[PDB]
Design a protein around this ligand. Structure first.
Ligand SMILES: [Ca+2]
Ligand SMILES: [Ca+2]
Ligand SMILES: [Ca+2]
Ligand SMILES: [Ca+2]
Ligand SMILES: [Ca+2]
Lengths: 127, 127
């Protein structure tokens, strides 16, 4: 829970996560890194000085990239999802992307939320 | 996709969905009901005249209750989740709840989003 939050240095994060930050957020500055946990999970969150955030699983694989203050770096977005978005919502940016073992969620700047299965088939549009 | 939306009467929705509306939204008025679909899914959405929405799977089982204009009827919220929310966020209402085959998402009026597994163990807090 919230009481279990533990601030850490970026160097205490999994190496996969450290690499991801360097790869995609080289131009951003880290405001706070923490380990988030409860009885049955552990994750890592990094918040940048512009308010954007990335959350990683215990292995350092991203699970949430929330760039609502700018937009999500395109390299992170699966090509089939980027094509769907740029075809059908050409005036929107992707503000957040999430993934788990079953789907991707994408939140657009026009407030639409899309969900895709792991084979990038559309399974929900919410406006 | 958006082009496939098909407006319908509420009586064309699965009976489980019709029952859910009557059970929990007796005081609301239906503005629009539709079948939503793409190649690999079908769902049903009902929007009320106050802007709240419920989405159901093809069988009429709710998957999203978005009551951001009021709050989610408490009877819909699993007891363990209601207890977590009312303990740790006593000033918040639940504005949306979602579920799938693996987790529940809950969005609170203070903008916090919580995720629980199907056994109601906390697996994410996002602020
Ligand atoms: Ca939908
Ligand atoms: Ca939905
Ligand atoms: Ca989800
Ligand atoms: Ca989190
Ligand atoms: Ca998260």
């Amino acid at each position: 829970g919230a009481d279990d939050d533990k601030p850490i240095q970026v160097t205490q994060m999994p190496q996969l996560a450290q690499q991801f930050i360097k790869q995609h957020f080289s131009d951003s500055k880290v405001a706070l890194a923490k380990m988030e946990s409860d009885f049955l999970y552990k994750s890592y969150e990094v918040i940048f000085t512009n308010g954007n955030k990335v959350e990683f699983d215990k292995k350092g694989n991203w699970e949430e990239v929330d760039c609502k203050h700018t937009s999500v770096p395109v390299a992170i977005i699966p090509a089939a999802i980027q094509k769907y978005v740029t075809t059908n919502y050409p005036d929107a940016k992707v503000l957040k992307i999430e993934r788990d073992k079953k789907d991707y969620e994408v939140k657009l700047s026009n407030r639409t939320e899309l969900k895709f299965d792991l084979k990038f088939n559309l399974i929900d549009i919410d406006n």
